[PDB]
């Protein structure tokens, strides 16, 4: 009965759920304004970057050091951690110009009274009460004054240090106890909170890509007038009386420092109005601060706390009724309940942000909490929890409590900062072996040159790993070439048959792709060319060509010995094919025999060319400056036009010949060994042909994905990735496809596509893992594009010297899936060529018609020469 009058009188201090949703929405707008780059400097809620980028792992370990500067205690803590199950961190502390740092800073040996640690150079966690502006984990300056984190160091005569808000320290120690804790919260002398934000949302820090803890400083929510319609006569007066009038308006209606004073002032207003005490106001009731937050807890805590109201009201010298002790009780509830409901509105907004960032239909999140009002007040926690869960029904939230706070939380942030830095240099020492200097890439260029000579030399051509094989392709297309030409493209991902229909005064192009069943690729050679010619027939019919008599160019991309344009002998099947009775055989004969067994059409097989050569001719039809061809794909190879005088395996010195380099075998004689890593060695030794195609295995095919998953497995074993947990998929050779490198490195911001892939190889991965995985794919694919570039530099610069030129303008026909679908690799190769062959001006061109079109052109050119 007396309550209902207080309830009615304090009516504006009892806030409905509807107005708490209004408030939380308002605080989200305040949230975005402080994160935004234009709005920040005018934002009331500053949304400060913490530079804490990871919550605790569970694996942290070490001896750590730290100090609480809050000024109440001025304590200095100590802690040690270990990665075993029991999570207790051993904690021991005792409380406490240029002379100004060194005053009690003498305790470096004085807090060694326990472990006498002054011989141990040791990391330092640092928590700092006053306000600052920090640009890094270690850096800051006070506004209420130059440097700090660096200035406390020159007072040295050992440390590694970071500086953190007490709300972040709270989140971090609750994080080591529960790994789901993304929010710190303090309700105490003051009130603030921090949470983990996505780096794409933090404009004030460059990044994209990652999470950072944001120190909201919500104490200042409302300093611009956004809370005025819920603020109160009593709030205005607490503000005007404050040491900081105008600032911290939300903190003042929440924090413990102002709650006693807020109910006092309410008593005074009611006494003066005859509603309490019979208007008899003692002297002490008018003295500021005598009704204290401590008292609000006592009145509300106990069985009969209506007596302890009476006990306190008389400590202030009054004559309370019982109906007076009842009113002071409910005035206490209304103040502390409004405080609790207000932290629930602004948490409701933070939890709604994290839910959005995350993508989960129900947020599962853990709030680390601390501070006088939360822990000691009997009912504040129950009302905060109950009120949050009502404002976010799609929550599942759980709160935790940290004994340490600003003390051990500053140590725990040093444990995570140390862990990260330690695992980083570990990963970086590895990745550095795949990072090649300018000088190194010139040496690669130089070594490719002598290997090119070695193979062109008839003396050394037998031992030489880069064979420099003659292609018997000497003649560009010339003016009039007429007629229909069949071509074949075999050995790529796509086997296809082509009819290029060439007019003069105009190349008409037609193709079709056919599958080769694994059973046929792995069958007998009869079955394989029977199948190929059954596709030629299905195509002739598809074209209404039926049995017409057509010449045939043939792109066959396997290591052959060519004795002439129409004769080449297969050395070894590669890629998918193992078909019997083929290796060691003329490939044109095997094809011709399969055409006769079909007994349908007459085909004249004029030429067999490597895909490099076919690609160079395709691109040269458009661009007459194209003297080179390059594949980066299932495999890597290249060809240029050499001088007949330099091709000793073919008699005569007049003119040009294209030479298939087989450059993938560069390094089969050892010449790359001192640029090769353990992961190269391992990929080589577990491959199908150990010791063969070493350069190919650094720059292309499946081999790139294998280098990645060899690195990722090396990292995981060392606990440097995925928190040490190995997937079974990840253990499988070939599982990490080279197209993942393109997808992972094309990915940005949330890195969702990287995670999708890591899921596929079923791995339990954080968003920081995705960043590390993307780092690895970028190193590997850059070493690939730089190596390919160092080879292609030697190629083009040799063409330049052969011709005496001071400057060479060349075009390089390129093809292969890795070159055209990877985001950076064409870019980085071109840069490497321009960097390593300054005297050459190299265009690259991307065929789009495939190497078949050049097979058909090489055929047409070979006809006119005989016609
Ligand atoms: O002390 C402050 C704010 C100081 C400040 C900053 C800028 C200006 Cl312009 C002014 Cl007038 C004051 N905030 C504290 C939080 O850092 C802390 O997390 C929380 C719990 O300890 O207490 C307070 O809310
Ligand atoms: O596959 C190979 C060669 C492999 C090879 C050679 C010799 C031996 Cl002894 C052994 Cl074990 C394997 N060469 C291909 C080139 O012909 C093709 O131009 C390029 C692009 O398709 O892919 C490959 O590099
Ligand atoms: O090796 P990949 O990724 O299939 O790319 C190489 C092939 O690419 C094709 O587009 C060309 O037409 C072929 O001549 C070539 O062999």
Curated annotation (Swiss-Prot):
Tissue spec: Predominant hexokinase isozyme expressed in insulin-responsive tissues such as skeletal muscle.
Oligomeric form and interacting partners: Monomer. Interacts with TIGAR; the interaction increases hexokinase activity in a hypoxia- and HIF1A-dependent manner.
Pathway: Carbohydrate metabolism; hexose metabolism; Carbohydrate degradation; glycolysis; D-glyceraldehyde 3-phosphate and glycerone phosphate from D-glucose: step 1/4
Record membrane topology: Peripheral membrane protein
Annotated organism of origin: Homo sapiens
Protein name from the UniProt record: Hexokinase-2
Record-listed D-glucose 1 binding positions: 129-130, 165-166, 192, 217, 248-251
Binding site for ATP 1: 14, 68-73, 382-383
Activity regulation info: Hexokinase activity is specifically inhibited by 2,6-disubstituted glucosamines.
Substitution effect: residue 166 to A: Decreased hexokinase activity
Signal peptide segment: none
InterPro entries cross-referenced by the UniProt entry: ATPase_NBD, Hexokinase, Hexokinase_BS, Hexokinase_C, Hexokinase_N
CC annotations in GO: centrosome; cytosol; intracellular membrane-bounded organelle; membrane; mitochondrial outer membrane; mitochondrion; sarcoplasmic reticulum
Binding annotation for D-glucose 6-phosphate 1: 68-72, 166, 189, 370-372, 406
């Amino acid at each position: 009965d007396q309550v209902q009058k207080v309830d009615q009188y304090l009516y504006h201090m009892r806030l409905s759920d509807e107005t708490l949703l209004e408030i939380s929405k308002r605080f989200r707008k305040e949230m975005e304004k402080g994160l935004g780059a234009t709005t920040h400097p005018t934002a009331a809620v500053k949304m400060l970057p913490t530079f804490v980028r990871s919550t605790p792992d569970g694996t942290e370990h070490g001896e750590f050091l730290a100090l609480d500067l809050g000024g109440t205690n001025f304590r200095v803590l100590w802690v040690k951690v270990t990665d075993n199950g029991l999570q207790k961190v051993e904690m021991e502390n005792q409380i406490y110009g240029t002379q100004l740092f060194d005053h009690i800073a003498e305790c470096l040996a004085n807090f060694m009274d326990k472990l006498q640690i002054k011989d141990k150079k040791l990391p330092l966690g640092f928590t700092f009460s006053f306000p600052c502006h920090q640009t890094k984990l270690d850096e800051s300056f006070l506004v209420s004054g130059r440097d700090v984190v660096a200035l406390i160091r020159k007072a040295i005569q050992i440390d590694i240090v970071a500086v953190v808000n007490d709300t972040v320290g709270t989140m971090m120690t609750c994080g080591y106890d529960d790994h789901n804790c993304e929010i710190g919260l303090i309700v105490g002398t003051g009130s603030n909170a921090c949470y983990m934000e996505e780096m794409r949302h933090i404009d004030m820090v460059e990044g994209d890509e990652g999470r950072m803890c944001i120190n909201m400083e919500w104490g200042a929510f409302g300093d611009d007038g956004s809370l005025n319609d819920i603020r109160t006569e009593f709030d205005q007066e607490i503000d005007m009386g404050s040491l900081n009038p105008g600032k911290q308006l939300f903190e003042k209606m929440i924090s413990g420092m102002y709650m006693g004073e807020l109910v006092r002032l309410i008593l005074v207003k009611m006494a003066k109005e005859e509603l309490l005490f019979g208007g008899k106001l003692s002297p002490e009731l008018l003295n500021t601060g005598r009704f204290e937050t401590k008292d609000i807890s006592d009145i509300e805590g106990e069985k009969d706390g209506i007596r302890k109201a009476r006990e306190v009201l008389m400590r202030l010298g009054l004559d309370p009724t019982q109906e007076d002790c009842v009113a002071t009780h409910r005035i206490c509830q209304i103040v502390s309940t409004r405080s609790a409901s207000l932290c629930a509105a602004t948490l409701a907004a933070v939890l709604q942000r994290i839910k959005e960032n995350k993508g989960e239909e129900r947020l599962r999140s853990t709030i680390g909490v601390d501070g006088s009002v939360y822990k000691k007040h009997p009912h504040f926690a129950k009302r905060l929890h109950k009120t949050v869960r009502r404002l976010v029904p799609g929550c599942d939230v759980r709160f935790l409590r940290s004994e340490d706070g600003s003390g051990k939380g500053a140590a725990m942030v040093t444990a995570v900062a140390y862990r990260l830095a330690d695992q980083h240099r570990a990963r970086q020492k590895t990745l550095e072996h795949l990072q090649l200097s300018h000088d190194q890439l010139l040496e690669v260029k130089r070594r490719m040159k002598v290997e090119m000579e070695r193979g062109l030399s008839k003396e050394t051509h037998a031992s030489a790993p880069v064979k420099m094989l003659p292609t018997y392709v000497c003649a560009t297309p010339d003016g009039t070439e007429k007629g229909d030409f069949l071509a074949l493209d075999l050995g790529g991902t796509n086997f296809r048959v082509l009819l290029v229909r060439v007019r003069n005064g105009g190349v008409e192009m037609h193709n079709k792709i056919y599958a080769i069943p694994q059973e046929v690729m792995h069958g007998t050679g009869d079955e394989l060319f029977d199948h190929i010619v059954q596709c030629i027939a299905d195509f002739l019919e598809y074209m209404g060509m039926k049995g017409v008599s057509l010449p045939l160019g043939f792109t066959f991309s396997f290591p052959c010995q060519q004795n002439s344009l129409d004769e080449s002998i297969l050395l070894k099947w590669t890629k998918g094919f193992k078909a019997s009775g083929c290796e060691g055989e003329d490939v044109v004969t095997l094809l011709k025999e399969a055409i006769h067994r079909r007994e349908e059409f007459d085909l004249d097989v004029v030429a067999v060319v490597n895909d490099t050569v076919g690609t160079m001719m395709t691109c040269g039809f458009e661009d007459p400056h194209c003297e080179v061809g390059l594949i980066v794909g299932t495999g890597s190879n290249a060809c240029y036009m050499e001088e007949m005088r330099n091709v000793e395996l073919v008699e005569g010195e007049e003119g040009r010949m294209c030479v298939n380099m087989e450059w993938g075998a560069f390094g089969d004689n050892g010449c790359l060994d001192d640029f090769r890593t353990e992961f190269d060695v391992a990929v080589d030794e577990l491959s199908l042909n150990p010791g063969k195609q070493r350069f190919e295995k650094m720059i292309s095919g499946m081999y790139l994905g294998e280098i990645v998953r060899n690195i990722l497995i090396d990292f995981t074993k060392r606990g440097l990735l995925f928190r040490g947990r190995i997937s079974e998929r990840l253990k499988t050779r070939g599982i990490f496809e080279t197209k993942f490198l393109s997808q992972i490195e094309s990915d940005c911001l949330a890195l969702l596509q990287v995670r999708a892939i890591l899921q596929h190889l079923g791995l339990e991965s954080t968003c920081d893992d995705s960043i590390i995985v993307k780092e690895v794919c970028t190193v590997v694919a850059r070493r690939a594009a730089q190596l390919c570039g160092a080879g292609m530099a030697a190629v083009v610069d040799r063409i330049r010297e052969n011709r005496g030129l001071d400057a060479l303008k060349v075009t390089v026909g390129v093809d292969g899936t890795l070159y055209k679908l990877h985001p950076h690799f064409a870019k980085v190769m071109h840069e490497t060529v321009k960097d390593l062959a300054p005297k050459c001006d190299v265009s690259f061109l991307q065929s789009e018609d495939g190497s078949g079109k050049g097979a058909a052109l090489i055929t047409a050119v070979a006809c006119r020469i005989r016609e």
